[PDB]
Design an enzyme around this catalytic site. Sequence first.
Site, PDB file in Angstrom:
ATOM      1  N   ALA A  10       0.837  -1.196   0.000  1.00 48.29           N
ATOM      2  CA  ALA A  10       0.000   0.000   0.000  1.00 48.29           C
ATOM      3  C   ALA A  10       0.874   1.249   0.000  1.00 48.29           C
ATOM      4  O   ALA A  10       1.847   1.331   0.755  1.00 48.29           O
ATOM      5  CB  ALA A  10      -0.926   0.003   1.219  1.00 48.29           C
ATOM      6  N   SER A  11       0.527   2.212  -0.853  1.00 49.37           N
ATOM      7  CA  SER A  11       1.277   3.465  -0.974  1.00 49.37           C
ATOM      8  C   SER A  11       1.496   4.043   0.414  1.00 49.37           C
ATOM      9  O   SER A  11       2.579   4.518   0.763  1.00 49.37           O
ATOM     10  CB  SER A  11       0.478   4.471  -1.800  1.00 49.37           C
ATOM     11  N   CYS A  12       0.422   3.987   1.186  1.00 47.99           N
ATOM     12  CA  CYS A  12       0.348   4.479   2.543  1.00 47.99           C
ATOM     13  C   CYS A  12       1.585   4.072   3.402  1.00 47.99           C
ATOM     14  O   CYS A  12       1.920   4.733   4.391  1.00 47.99           O
ATOM     15  CB  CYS A  12      -1.008   3.983   3.120  1.00 47.99           C
ATOM     16  N   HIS A  13       2.308   3.024   2.999  1.00 47.04           N
ATOM     17  CA  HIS A  13       3.478   2.574   3.767  1.00 47.04           C
ATOM     18  C   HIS A  13       4.800   2.677   3.005  1.00 47.04           C
ATOM     19  O   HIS A  13       5.773   1.984   3.324  1.00 47.04           O
ATOM     20  CB  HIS A  13       3.256   1.131   4.210  1.00 47.04           C
TER      21      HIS A  13
END
Lengths: 400, 403
Positions: free
Chosen positions: B344-347
Site C-alpha cells: 500500500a502506498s500508505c506505507h
Amino acid sequence: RKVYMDYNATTPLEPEVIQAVTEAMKEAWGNPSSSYVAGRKAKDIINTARASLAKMIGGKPQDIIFTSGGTESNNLVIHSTVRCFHEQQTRPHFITCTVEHDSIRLPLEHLVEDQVAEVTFVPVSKVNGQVEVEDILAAVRPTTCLVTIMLANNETGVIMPISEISRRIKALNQIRAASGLPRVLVHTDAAQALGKRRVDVEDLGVDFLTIVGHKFYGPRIGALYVRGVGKLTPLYPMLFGGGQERNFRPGTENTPMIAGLGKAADLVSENCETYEAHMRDIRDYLEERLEAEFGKRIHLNSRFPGVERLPNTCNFSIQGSQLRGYMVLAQCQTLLASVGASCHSDHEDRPSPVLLSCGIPVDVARNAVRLSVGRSTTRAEVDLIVQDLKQAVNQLEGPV
Amino acid sequence: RKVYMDYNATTPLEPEVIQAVTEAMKEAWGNPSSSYVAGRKAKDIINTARASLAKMIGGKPQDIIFTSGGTESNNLVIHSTVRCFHEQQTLGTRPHFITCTVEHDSIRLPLEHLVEDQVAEVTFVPVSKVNGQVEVEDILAAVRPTTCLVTIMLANNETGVIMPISEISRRIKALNQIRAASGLPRVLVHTDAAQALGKRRVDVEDLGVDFLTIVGHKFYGPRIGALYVRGVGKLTPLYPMLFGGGQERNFRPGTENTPMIAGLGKAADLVSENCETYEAHMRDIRDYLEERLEAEFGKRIHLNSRFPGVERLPNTCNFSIQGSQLRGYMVLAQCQTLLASVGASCHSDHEDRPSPVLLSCGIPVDVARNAVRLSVGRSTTRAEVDLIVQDLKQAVNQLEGPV
Ligand SMILES: *Cc1c(COP(=O)(O)O)cnc(C)c1O
Ligand SMILES: *Cc1c(COP(=O)(O)O)cnc(C)c1O
C-alpha cells in the site's frame, strides 16, 4: 442577462483556477505517496499549494492542513479541542458567539446536547451586531479551552474584533500559566474574509483559522491553519488512516482540488487589495442607488455604528408587509441573490436568526435580502438590479 | 517510456471523467442549495451522479451519500456504529466490532483507536495463512452479544484476494433472526469495496451488506468517494461525523463539490457500462504476466497472489524473486521502465519493512521481504508486460552482479 450578487453564498472559479485543476487532473494524477516520479510530481504541486495558502494568510507552509472544506475545518478544530482537554486531564468549555455559521454553531450545540462539553454562546451586541471583547473575556472559566469567533459574518458582513480577542486572551493566558492552568486557544472562521480583506495570522493572533476555497473563487475544498501544529499548537485528528497530512488528516490527497486552491490563494495574495477596493466601490454605489430609489422605505442592515464590514456586502430590507425577502427576489427577473445563508434556503419565510440576534426587528428581518457583490460586478449591473427591485416592489407592495 | 502497473495505488482519470469535471467547474458552479436556476442546475448534476453510483453497485439513489473519499467513508461507518449502539441502549458499556487482520489503514486504525480509548472492543480476526482469506466460520465464531458491526474488505489491496462477503452477510442475516428472537440487537455488515469497483461486478443485493465504501480514484474517477447505506433512514441508521449546513440530508454537511461529484458519477457510468470488459481484459493481461514471469525467472519466482480455493482481483499479481539482494524496493529502484510498488502506498516511507499483510497471509518473511505488487489496468497490453519483464530481468542481474 442575469446579475449575480450572491458571492457570499459561493463564487465562480477564476479561469486560472480552472486551468490549474485541469492540468493537475491530466499531468499530476499519480499517488502523492508513491516513490516514483509521477507521485513526486503530484506532491510538488501539493507542496507549492501549501506555500500559496500560507503566503495568503501570512503564516508558514507547515501551518497549513488541507481539508475537504470549511465545514470539515470547523468541525476539526472543535473535535481536536475536546480531545486535547481529555489528554490534558469536568468537561471542556467553549466560547463562541450567537451568529456563527452552522458548521460552528451545530457541532457545539451537539456537544452540549450530548453533555460532552459546556458552551457559552456569547450574544452579539444588538447595537453594532458585533460580539464584544469584554463579554468574551468575562466568559472564560478554568475549563475554557477554546474561543471560536468568526472573522466576518456571512449575512451582515460585520467584522469581529479578532485581533483584540487574541491579545486579551494572550494576556489572560499569562496568568493562567503561572497558576498552572492550560492556555485558552483561539480559532477564527475566516471563510468570508479571504479575498475580501487582508488576512494575516500574526495580526489576528489566532492559533487556528478556517480557509474556505469556494468563497475566494477556488474549488470546493479548504484547509485549516494551525500555528506551529504539533509544536506550538496541538491538533488531534478526526480521521484515521494512511498518514497523509502528517496524520492530521489522512486520505489520498486530492491533487487537482489542491492545485486549484493554491492558484486561488495566489490570486488573493497578489490582488486582494484590488478586489477589496472594487467590491467596496460597487457596494457603496449600490447602497447609494438603493437609497436614492427607495428613500425612507429602505433599511441598510449591514451599516452598524463603529464597526468594520466586508466591502462587498449589503444586507437590506424595504418597508412593507408584502416585501418579504424571498417574495421580492422571486419577482426579480435579473437579480440573483439570497435572504441569508444558502444553508437555510428551505425556510426563507422565517426571519434570519442571525439578523434577529443583531437587533434587527422581526418585520425588518422578514424583508431582508442579502446582496454580496464580486470581483466582476459593475455599476451598470447595480443599476440593472436596482430597477429590477423597483418593479418587484411595485408589484408586491404597490405604489405608496 | 514508462509502463504503469500500480493501478491499485491509484488510477488516472478517464478522458470523459476529466471532461465531466471541467464542464461542471465552468457551467455548474452555483451553490446547490441556492433558490435560483444556477443552484438548481448544480443540484441536478449531483442527483444524476447519485443515480449513477447507485446503478454501479445495484442499489438505489437514496442510499448513496457522497464523502471526501474512502478514508472518510470508512471512518464514518465506524463512528456511526458507535453512536447507534449507545442510542439504541438509551432508548460503561462498549460496542463490539469484528474485522480481519488485513484491512486498509482507514479501517484498522480507527478501530485500534477505539480500543485504545476504551470506546469499543474489537476482534481482529486472523485471515487464513493457507488461502489468505478471512474465513466465514471464524467471523461468526467471534460474534458476541454486543457485536454491532462486521466490517470486512471485499478485496485486499496487496494480494487481490476476495473475501466471502456475500456468505458472511448470509450467515449474519440468519444469526440476526436468532438474536431478534432473544431480543438482542442486530449485527450490521459493511465492506470496504475500494479495490473491487471497476474490476469485478459489485452488487449490494448479491453481497447482502448494510454499508459499502466507494472510492473514486480506484476506478478512474476523482479523489472523492461515497458510502452506500441500505435504505438509510428506513432500514439502516447513519449518524453523522460532521455537523453543519444540512447537505446530504445532514448525513454529510458542507457545500457539495459539484465538479468532483460530476467526475465520480461519470466514472461510475463507465463501470456500469464496461465492467465486464475491464475485468476480462485485466485477467488476460495479468495471467499473461504471471506466465511470462515464471518463464523468465523459473523456480526463483514466488507468486503471492495465487492462494488455493479463493477468488482474486483480475488485475493483481503480487510476486517475489528469491535472493538476499532482491528486496522489493531494491528491485524497483533498478527498474527503468516499470512503475509499481511493494505494498500500500500508505506505507512507502518504510518499504524496507516486510508487508504486515503478506506476513498475516502466511507468506514467509524471506518471500515477503522481496514482494513487489503489480496491478495492471484497462489500457495495459501484453507488449507492455514483455517490457517490464525484461526490465525486471535487467534489474535483478544488476542487483546480483559485482559490487
Ligand atoms: C461558507 C462558510 C463556511 C463553510 O461552509 P461550507 O458549506 O463547508 O463551504 C463556514 N463559515 C462561514 C461563515 C461561511 O460563510
Ligand atoms: C484506496 C483504499 C481505501 C481508501 O483510501 P483513500 O487514501 O482515502 O483513497 C480504502 N480501502 C482500501 C482497501 C483501499 O485500497
